[PDB]
Amino acid sequence: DGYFPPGTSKHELIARASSLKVSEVKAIIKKQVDEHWDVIRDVCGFKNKEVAYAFFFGMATRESTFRAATETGSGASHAFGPLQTAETAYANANPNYMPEHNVPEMHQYDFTEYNFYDVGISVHMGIRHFLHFARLAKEKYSGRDIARHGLMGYNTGWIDGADESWIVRYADETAALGAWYLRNNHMSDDEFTWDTDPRVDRSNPWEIYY
Ligand SMILES: OC[C@H]1O[C@@H](O[C@H]2[C@H](O)[C@@H](O)[C@H](O[C@H]3[C@H](O)[C@@H](O)[C@H](O[C@@H]4[C@@H](CO)O[C@](O)(CO)[C@H]4O)O[C@@H]3CO)O[C@@H]2CO)[C@H](O)[C@@H](O)[C@@H]1O
Ligand SMILES: OC[C@H]1O[C@@H](O[C@H]2[C@H](O)[C@@H](O)[C@H](O[C@H]3[C@H](O)[C@@H](O)[C@H](O[C@H]4[C@H](O)[C@@H](O)[C@H](O)O[C@@H]4CO)O[C@@H]3CO)O[C@@H]2CO)[C@H](O)[C@@H](O)[C@@H]1O
Ligand SMILES: [Mn+2]
């Protein structure tokens, strides 16, 4: 899963992440979806792999605008990378973080500076972390609600925490942003959208995925 060379320093990992082209970040995401398609499909029920690429492009857009060196927050809210993978995704981080032992199909990397700051590990771990919350959601939700409430867990820690406005502005927006890439033939190029971009169709945004 590691992208940059083993032993690369924090500041080099960050500089190199900031230099990745949109196309390069899309390729990292696609590789991880390819590797982990069976568990992604099993949990989320996405139609096919292409729409799963688009969903995770939607997450990259919503969380970082594809700026892979984005870093935010403190403690449980401290996140890095294109998907804003928080410390809580990682094994052997703070012992008070809620455990994520419900995704045996994906390696859970330990919390280390390489594993948190390397783009490859960060993307793998963000997918794993999302699946952790989507599986919490699947206990009570079906169809689009698995990914919709799984996203709310990803961002807030709680699948049912959020008010409708934030479900719309975070989860529905993620779905809409991801679909932009598929609908406009931007699955491999350097083009990107962004939260609230008026180019994006954000009406019935879950449609393409199922
Ligand atoms: O009560 C049960 C236990 O709770 C533990 O605290 C939880 C807390 O309740 C959750 O809200 C918090 O959730 C994190 C979540 O894990 C992260 O994925 C998320 O990451 C965000 C990321 C992606 O959107 O980007 C940010 O927005 C950038 O800032 C991140 O915020 O952040 C959520 C909010 O912090 O997780 C903690 C830890 O599991 C207590 O620690 C326990 O003592 C308690 O038993
Ligand atoms: O809270 C969830 C998540 O948020 C992440 O931060 C997001 C912001 O939520 C989101 O609003 C923000 O969107 C910006 C984007 O950064 C800009 O690049 C983009 O700029 C547009 C501009 O609005 C247009 O006028 C111009 O023509 O084009 C540019 C694009 O080239 O504007 C949007 C909307 O304001 O993106 C943030 C991510 O980059 C946090 O990072 C994350 O931690 C949170 O979990
Ligand atoms: Mn992987």
Numbering used by the authors: 141 to 350
Which statements did the authors publish about this structure?
RtGH124 is the defining member of CAZY family GH124. Unusually for R. thermocellum, RtGH124A is not targeted to the multi-enzyme cellulosome complex of the organism but instead consists of a ‘dockerin’ domain which instead targets the enzyme to the cell surface of the bacterium, followed by a CAZY GH124 catalytic domain; RtGh124 is therefore an unusual enzyme if its primary role is in cellulose degradation yet it is not part of the cellulose complex. Here, we show that the metal-ion site of GH124 can accommodate a variety of metal ions (but not Ca2+) and that the histidine is modified by a carbonyl group at C2 to make 2-oxohistidine (but only at a fraction of approximately 0.5). Metal binding also occurs with a stoichiometry of approximately 0.5 (in solution by ITC and in the crystal through occupancy refinement) and we are thus unable to deconvolute whether the 2-oxohistidine is required for metal binding or antithetical to it.
In passing, we determined a series of structures of GH124 co-crystallized with cellohexaose which revealed the unusual binding of a contaminant, a terminally fructosylated cellooligosaccharide, with unambiguous density at ∼1 Å resolution. Clear electron density indicated that the reducing-end sugar was not glucose, as expected, but a 1–4-linked fructose moiety. The hexasaccharide appears not to be cleaved, as four to six molecules of each chain have been observed in all of the structures (data not shown). Enzyme subsites −4 to −1 are occupied by one molecule and +1 to +4 by another, with both of them stabilized in the crystal by a second molecule in the same asymmetric unit. Our initial thought was that the fructosylated oligosaccharide would be likely to represent a very minor contaminant in the G6 preparation, one somehow selected by the enzyme owing to tighter binding and/or inhibitory potential. The originally purchased G6 sample contained an approximately 1:1 ratio of G6 and G5F (but subsequently purchased batches were 100% G6), highlighting that the unusual observed species was simply a contaminant in the commercial supply of G6 available at that time. Manganese is coordinated by Asp141, Gln172, Glu175, His176, His264 and a water molecule. High-resolution structures of RtGH124 (1.40–0.94 Å) have revealed an unambiguous modification of C2 of His264. In the case of manganese, the metal and the His264 modification both display partial occupancies of 0.7 and 0.3, respectively.
